[PDB]
Amino acid sequence: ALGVALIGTGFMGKCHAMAWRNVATAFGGLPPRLEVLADMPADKAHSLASSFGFARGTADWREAVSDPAVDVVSITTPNGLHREMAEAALAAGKHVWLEKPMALSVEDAQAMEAAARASDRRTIIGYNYTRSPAFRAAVDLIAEGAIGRPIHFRGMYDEDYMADPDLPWSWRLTRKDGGLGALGDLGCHLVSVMVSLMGPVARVYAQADTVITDRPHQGGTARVENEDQAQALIRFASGTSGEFSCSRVARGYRCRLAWEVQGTEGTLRFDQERMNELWLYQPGRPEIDGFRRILTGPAQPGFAAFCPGGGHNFGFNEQKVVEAEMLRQAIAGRGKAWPDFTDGLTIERVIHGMATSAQTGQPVNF
Amino acid sequence: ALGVALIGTGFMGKCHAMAWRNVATAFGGLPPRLEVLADMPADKAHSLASSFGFARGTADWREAVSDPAVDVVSITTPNGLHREMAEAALAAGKHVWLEKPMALSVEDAQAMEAAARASDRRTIIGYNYTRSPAFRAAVDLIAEGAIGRPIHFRGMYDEDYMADPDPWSWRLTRKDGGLGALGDLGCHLVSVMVSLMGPVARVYAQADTVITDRPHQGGTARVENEDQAQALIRFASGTSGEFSCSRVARGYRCRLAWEVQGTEGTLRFDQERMNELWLYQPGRPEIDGFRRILTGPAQPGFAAFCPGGGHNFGFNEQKVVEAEMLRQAIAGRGKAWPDFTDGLTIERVIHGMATSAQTGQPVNF
Amino acid sequence: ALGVALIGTGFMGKCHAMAWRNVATAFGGLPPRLEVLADMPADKAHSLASSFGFARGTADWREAVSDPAVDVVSITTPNGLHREMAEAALAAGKHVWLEKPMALSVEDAQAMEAAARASDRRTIIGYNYTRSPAFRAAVDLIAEGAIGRPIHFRGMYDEDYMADPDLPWSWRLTRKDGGLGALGDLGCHLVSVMVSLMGPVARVYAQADTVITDRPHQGGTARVENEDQAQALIRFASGTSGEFSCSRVARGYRCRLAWEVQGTEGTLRFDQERMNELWLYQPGRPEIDGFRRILTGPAQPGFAAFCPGGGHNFGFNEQKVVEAEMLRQAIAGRGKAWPDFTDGLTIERVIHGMATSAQTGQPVNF
Amino acid sequence: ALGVALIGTGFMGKCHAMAWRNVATAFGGLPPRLEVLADMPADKAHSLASSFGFARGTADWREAVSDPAVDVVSITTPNGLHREMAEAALAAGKHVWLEKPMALSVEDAQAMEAAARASDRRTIIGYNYTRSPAFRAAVDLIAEGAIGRPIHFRGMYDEDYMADPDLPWSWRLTRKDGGLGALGDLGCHLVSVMVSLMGPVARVYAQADTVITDRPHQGGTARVENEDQAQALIRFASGTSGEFSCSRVARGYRCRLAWEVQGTEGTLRFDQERMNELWLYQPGRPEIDGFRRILTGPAQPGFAAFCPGGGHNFGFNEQKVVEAEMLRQAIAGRGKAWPDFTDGLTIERVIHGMATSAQTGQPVNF
Ligand SMILES: NC(=O)c1ccc[n+]([C@@H]2O[C@H](COP(=O)([O-])OP(=O)(O)OC[C@H]3O[C@@H](n4cnc5c(N)ncnc54)[C@H](O)[C@@H]3O)[C@@H](O)[C@H]2O)c1
Ligand SMILES: NC(=O)c1ccc[n+]([C@@H]2O[C@H](COP(=O)([O-])OP(=O)(O)OC[C@H]3O[C@@H](n4cnc5c(N)ncnc54)[C@H](O)[C@@H]3O)[C@@H](O)[C@H]2O)c1
Ligand SMILES: NC(=O)c1ccc[n+]([C@@H]2O[C@H](COP(=O)([O-])OP(=O)(O)OC[C@H]3O[C@@H](n4cnc5c(N)ncnc54)[C@H](O)[C@@H]3O)[C@@H](O)[C@H]2O)c1
Ligand SMILES: NC(=O)c1ccc[n+]([C@@H]2O[C@H](COP(=O)([O-])OP(=O)(O)OC[C@H]3O[C@@H](n4cnc5c(N)ncnc54)[C@H](O)[C@@H]3O)[C@@H](O)[C@H]2O)c1
Ligand SMILES: O[C@H]1[C@H](O)[C@@H](O)[C@H](O)[C@@H](O)[C@H]1O
Ligand SMILES: O[C@H]1[C@H](O)[C@@H](O)[C@H](O)[C@@H](O)[C@H]1O
Ligand SMILES: O[C@H]1[C@H](O)[C@@H](O)[C@H](O)[C@@H](O)[C@H]1O
């Protein structure tokens, strides 16, 4: 069994834990051994290792990535910590499951990518919205020619977690430790999905905005630095056109990663807030012509490992189980995992390229 | 930590396995120990006990219920085994997580309800559709007066797994399944309905078998029970109700959809979109209409799985919540619903409906 | 050109006026001659006669009905006035376009039916939800065998126009002017749709409720004389099962006439609040299997006469234009108007049979 | 009564006819007298003038614009004739209801604008998607402060009427006729809506494609000369951002003019294919937080003129009756008609500016 370390226990830390714990339940093989949990403070690491079923808990992550019983390290700590912990893991000869985005900057991502290439260990970044059965059915459909040649992509990713202007400031909202705003938190997820459907991005023209430029900082106010929303027009390497957006201030949306691929012979549309539906249009006779609602079931990739009956809604967390497995297969030498630090660095260059574009009012070519 | 035995590894068996494995991960406390898994043949039981992380797999269910390390038994076998397995598990001093419906008959459920009181062990029936954050949110809203006085209920549960020509399940026999759509789906619809409306007083029902033989069985494969059924309800309150279920309603996969029309509002839900609760309350005319409430941390259960609203809660995660309730009842910190007593009433409703359909007569409770 | 008389100018009266005005615009032939309009008081009739484009107004309907420049009469007055007005019109040798339901009782409907047969004039009842391109396409699809044989019908008609208890007492709530409550006002519509799709009703078992027992009336407090809601289980002459309901207190719904036909080889589903969509499931390959959203367009009956492009939503009022056209054609002998007073009589026996079942607690066979 | 001439009887011609016959029926006043109808050949004009309720049909549009009994002229002919016809109507001192877009080029629009100012006659351009009860409710909800300050617009207009590559090379596909492609046919309508929500446009950056470049043409094939789809990033004069697209080859879509405004305090979203629904998000307590589905009814502007009860879906064609009313009110010197040829000119510069941008690869500033 694969020896597992986990660093962090928050939103993603718990998600990885629940995933590791059931990956063998779903897909077979041996359950991974949950060796070490790292979080701060110590008493919290001990508590959570107990209730997560980990063999021990530590307040010292370096110990976790060092442990001889570990082969793989889940890294679910804040973006400013990714580079250091990732690199230390790879140097200790461990495979790495790293949360997105890779780091704060393209330069950090590049350093990490070089580390990974040296190491010969397997890596994967936590672009979990590419794990849904519906998204994977969509990719297969386009490959099968269900919509002919793609002629346009339109995608968005709206959430409203920062829309309230009273929400307190933090260094996340600075360029340092924070990095990009909406592009770094959400943009990257959209790019991960978009390039899987349409191929590599050849060019972007973008614009960005900070809507809420000043926030309470225990007293007066602090200037928010990164962007609350960004949009971009795209040209892919195939030459086809695309539209792109992201926002952390789009009121009423909670997880609205929504995309569509219009093709010569059809159209596919999807909204993550209803992650179990794939809308497919193909030309038919006039009398019955129209979009089909394909409800996620065992006909789609990965679904049948969790449930034999269609229409039993596949959940967000279960995406993470599929991700664990893809890494599990890569480590077992049986299948390449996407995206690794090399694949992820391209995604980093895209979102940062869009940021550069926005600042300059000039298109950026990749 | 609770010792767990699991009987069955099919649709619901595998579901219970995933739930027991993550109950503590979501809700804290100590993770349950996965002790014994039972299924046939033995080779299958062995491989799956290993992948599911169970200490052993066996082809002998009695071995699972008698393991001293076990405190609780998940029974996920065909309906025709529920009674024997549940009564054995109770007599063995184990708490029971029994899959719905209880058994083949009301008499069976009567026997099991008596045993459950005698055992002084906790019981819960697998009505996992009452565990969604959206559903739990609805109940709380109604109790708050959000929709005022419930004046009508309209409920359905449509699926189409029997509509497919390609097959043969135990669900189609009287000795393995019992009732057809009413036993396999109807009961779920009842569990939801009485949780919203209070107990049933009267039913008038009708039923049909639309596919009499399983096309690809070689031999005769007579469907021994109903493919669909509908009923008018009167609740103990005096309120009206519409009820139906079907395993042949083509294009539906898990369409357990209900609504409660109140004097002050309406609540509506469809399990195919289990993350949405529609709420209408009267407002200013210029902004009047139903609200799509997207499941999130403000709903019961959800926060334990995710701090961000809109990250769709899953079918399988309803089962994690179900497990947590049994586990809280087991610790004397809550009361599990429905136990074998509450479940008995449910069996009466669906079997009353089946009777009403057989006789062309109303049935009172 | 056909000579028109119109009695009433409210909800349906204005609908009828608008329909006659554009019937020839839509379908060709000669525009009807808008001859006489009748409403009270007189000032109101002459005023609306002017704005509706009618040659004259009057406060006395009887004159309008026997005016020799009139060939057809639209009757859009409360239910209590239907029988008298229709019987008078027919006996003058005029065709009649009558608002639903026929009158207060089954006896009224039998009286009206007899008068119509003796008069040898055309009649049509205003069941306008049978006139939508989506509905008519549904009936055709069933006929062509798109969903095999029907095995179940589930229908409802929810509105909340009496859901607020403060709303004033109105004629729809009296047995003298309305007759039945939600069964008379909404239920009849549901039946007209249901029988078009499933065939005749063989049996019903029903229950009914008055949720708001009293209402403000000028001074205050008046008792509601008929039902706010009703439901019924149906057996059709075919043997097939049905579910049926209606309500005027169903909070949040405005025109939710929603039905579905579940067949052996597919399913059809419709909701009048989205009267441009017809949902059709037929079995398909697993990977693309699901309900189609058919958007109303020129391939559906009647639509091409209003617009040559699909997706330009056909409206409520245009159903009435279709309805006038079917009446014109019938009067000219080139078509059948459905439902006439005879077909209308059947509809009335169903709804009153439901009322009876509700009162007795026993099934009612037809 | 207003004297009305109508030129053209097709898609919009017939829609204008239906609108002029019921404008008074809906909003009171005197019914406009339908004087002259022009279309070709003559026999068709005679036939349709009879069935449209027009006093006479003619094959010569110039006759209609000069008739002394005419006060206002509807112009529903292809784009290349708009300039000529409008300028002539105005020269004869007639009021003008002109179909979109104004013409083939900015230059044309400039001349027509000056022509319009030179006469002292009313003009309105046929941007009917701004007449819907839902849209007008949206605008008033914003003006009422419903969503705070707009911070982003996302708009699209997808149709597939050109998706089939075997459709014959026809007028919307030419420069000399047609002008722009998707931008001139669908884009303009999106801008009409967009500037009504976000105000004027400061800057665009756009991309465009011809996806089907060749089409059957009398035993041969001809080159398509304008775009099938276009997209743009927008910077509004207010400093706010926007996304914009249109397409005539977006498979499955029939009239998908969908738009969204995300504000500091709320969100509004709309889709013409369901023109009777308006989605509104305002912050609520978390228990009941979410988008409201607002079903078009009497609370929304214009609706009560057509129907006293909500839910009775307002049609595409009834947008035009509203448009007619707005014009009658402007002629009567009450309400002003938007957009006139001056507001229209701006919309033309925008769509042509996107076209320029897409052609050159450069941002275009206004
Ligand atoms: N893939 C996805 O869908 C997704 C979703 C949410 C967050 N994320 C990513 O997950 C990462 C964490 O996000 P989150 O929402 O879980 O943040 P969080 O604040 O919920 O959790 C951070 C975790 O890291 C721990 N931590 C912080 N500093 C530490 C240190 N020095 N040593 C050990 N532990 C430390 C915290 O105590 C906590 O356990 C971020 O990189 C974010 O981008 C990804
Ligand atoms: N709550 C739910 O949503 C849900 C879903 C599916 C089934 N169910 C209920 O759960 C139960 C199981 O249904 P399922 O769909 O998982 O059926 P299934 O056929 O998929 O699984 C049944 C399992 O029981 C095992 N089994 C059969 N006979 C056995 C024996 N003699 N000893 C030990 N194991 C035996 C089978 O080998 C199989 O592993 C039924 O009671 C059903 O009504 C509930
Ligand atoms: N088919 C449909 O979709 C539809 C929709 C709404 C109403 N209806 C039916 O239309 C009919 C009228 O409904 P409504 O909502 O228009 O009612 P309403 O209250 O709007 O109008 C009643 C009309 O009758 C007139 N009236 C009353 N007494 C009269 C008399 N003695 N002489 C002349 N005119 C008289 C009133 O002045 C008014 O014009 C009813 O039978 C109702 O069932 C049908
Ligand atoms: N606002 C909308 O929703 C909408 C919808 C469709 C079209 N349009 C616009 O309406 C206009 C017409 O498009 P359509 O789809 O109605 O085209 P169409 O081809 O359906 O009809 C064109 C009409 O113009 C007539 N015509 C052509 N040359 C003429 C001449 N010399 N004299 C008189 N009549 C002549 C044709 O006979 C026909 O009646 C275009 O400018 C288009 O952009 C707007
Ligand atoms: O598919 C159905 C349904 O999904 C229920 O959840 C399950 O309990 C039934 O046994 C199964 O037959
Ligand atoms: O709003 C309702 C309903 O829309 C019916 O169409 C109409 O016939 C009723 O009389 C009216 O009350
Ligand atoms: O079908 C399209 C579109 O629906 C618009 O309504 C119209 O203005 C266009 O000209 C027509 O091409």
Tab-separated table of C-alpha atoms and ligand atoms in Angstrom, chain A residues 7-16 38-41 44 48 58-62 75-82 84-85 98-102 125-129 157 172 184-185 188-189 316 319-320 323, chain B residues 307 311, ligand 1:
chain	number	residue	atom	x	y	z
A	7	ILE	CA	-0.071	18.672	4.895
A	8	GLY	CA	-2.963	20.832	6.027
A	9	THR	CA	-6.529	20.051	7.074
A	10	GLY	CA	-8.738	22.844	5.789
A	11	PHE	CA	-11.139	23.018	2.892
A	12	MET	CA	-8.726	20.961	0.725
A	13	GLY	CA	-6.955	19.111	3.545
A	14	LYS	CA	-10.208	17.436	4.531
A	15	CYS	CA	-11.082	16.918	0.843
A	16	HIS	CA	-7.749	14.968	0.254
A	38	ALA	CA	0.893	17.834	9.362
A	39	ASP	CA	-0.933	20.939	10.621
A	40	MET	CA	-0.559	23.718	13.239
A	41	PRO	CA	-0.781	23.920	16.119
A	44	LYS	CA	-4.912	20.317	16.338
A	48	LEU	CA	-7.411	15.759	13.244
A	58	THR	CA	2.767	16.659	13.724
A	59	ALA	CA	3.083	20.478	13.885
A	60	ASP	CA	6.226	20.097	11.717
A	61	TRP	CA	5.536	19.464	8.040
A	62	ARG	CA	9.235	18.828	7.184
A	75	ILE	CA	-0.067	19.550	-0.017
A	76	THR	CA	-3.180	21.599	0.898
A	77	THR	CA	-1.658	24.640	2.561
A	78	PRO	CA	-1.890	28.264	1.421
A	79	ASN	CA	-0.451	29.247	-1.968
A	80	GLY	CA	2.553	31.053	-0.449
A	81	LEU	CA	3.726	27.763	1.091
A	82	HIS	CA	3.379	25.513	-2.064
A	84	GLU	CA	8.819	25.374	-0.438
A	85	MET	CA	6.862	22.256	0.599
A	98	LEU	CA	-0.282	19.758	-4.849
A	99	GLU	CA	-3.220	22.117	-4.559
A	100	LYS	CA	-3.671	24.814	-7.178
A	101	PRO	CA	-2.429	27.250	-8.149
A	102	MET	CA	1.197	26.110	-8.249
A	125	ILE	CA	-2.039	19.556	-9.280
A	126	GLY	CA	-5.517	19.710	-7.757
A	127	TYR	CA	-7.573	20.807	-10.798
A	128	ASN	CA	-10.462	18.762	-9.575
A	129	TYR	CA	-13.176	20.186	-11.848
A	157	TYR	CA	-16.161	30.944	-13.330
A	172	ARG	CA	-4.010	37.379	0.144
A	184	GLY	CA	-5.181	32.649	-9.310
A	185	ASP	CA	-8.054	31.326	-7.261
A	188	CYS	CA	-6.675	28.608	-13.236
A	189	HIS	CA	-9.518	26.071	-12.759
A	316	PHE	CA	-17.762	17.701	-5.605
A	319	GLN	CA	-14.068	14.455	-7.937
A	320	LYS	CA	-11.111	14.352	-5.521
A	323	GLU	CA	-7.957	12.581	-8.796
B	307	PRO	CA	-17.115	25.207	3.938
B	311	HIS	CA	-19.877	22.587	-4.189
E	1	LIG	N1	-8.764	22.417	-5.973
E	1	LIG	C1	-9.769	23.121	-5.410
E	1	LIG	O1	-10.931	23.051	-5.860
E	1	LIG	C2	-9.514	24.013	-4.203
E	1	LIG	C3	-10.541	24.517	-3.408
E	1	LIG	C4	-10.217	25.352	-2.309
E	1	LIG	C5	-8.890	25.676	-2.006
E	1	LIG	N2	-7.927	25.188	-2.817
E	1	LIG	C6	-6.524	25.414	-2.579
E	1	LIG	O2	-6.230	24.684	-1.383
E	1	LIG	C7	-5.223	25.386	-0.679
E	1	LIG	C8	-5.717	25.583	0.706
E	1	LIG	O3	-6.938	26.252	0.545
E	1	LIG	P1	-7.983	26.124	1.744
E	1	LIG	O4	-9.308	26.713	1.290
E	1	LIG	O5	-8.049	24.650	2.110
E	1	LIG	O6	-7.244	27.104	2.874
E	1	LIG	P2	-7.491	26.775	4.469
E	1	LIG	O7	-7.162	28.058	5.214
E	1	LIG	O8	-8.878	26.128	4.602
E	1	LIG	O9	-6.522	25.607	4.997
E	1	LIG	C9	-5.103	25.796	5.055
E	1	LIG	C10	-4.533	24.615	5.800
E	1	LIG	O10	-3.115	24.753	5.852
E	1	LIG	C11	-2.700	24.792	7.242
E	1	LIG	N3	-1.434	25.514	7.321
E	1	LIG	C12	-1.201	26.819	7.058
E	1	LIG	N4	0.117	27.104	7.256
E	1	LIG	C13	0.708	25.941	7.603
E	1	LIG	C14	2.071	25.506	7.917
E	1	LIG	N5	3.074	26.381	7.891
E	1	LIG	N6	2.282	24.215	8.238
E	1	LIG	C15	1.267	23.308	8.258
E	1	LIG	N7	-0.011	23.633	7.969
E	1	LIG	C16	-0.321	24.908	7.643
E	1	LIG	C17	-3.880	25.449	7.950
E	1	LIG	O11	-3.899	25.293	9.365
E	1	LIG	C18	-4.969	24.676	7.250
E	1	LIG	O12	-4.946	23.348	7.747
E	1	LIG	C19	-5.007	26.716	-1.383
E	1	LIG	O13	-3.816	26.538	-2.123
E	1	LIG	C20	-6.156	26.863	-2.353
E	1	LIG	O14	-5.777	27.455	-3.586
E	1	LIG	C21	-8.210	24.378	-3.856
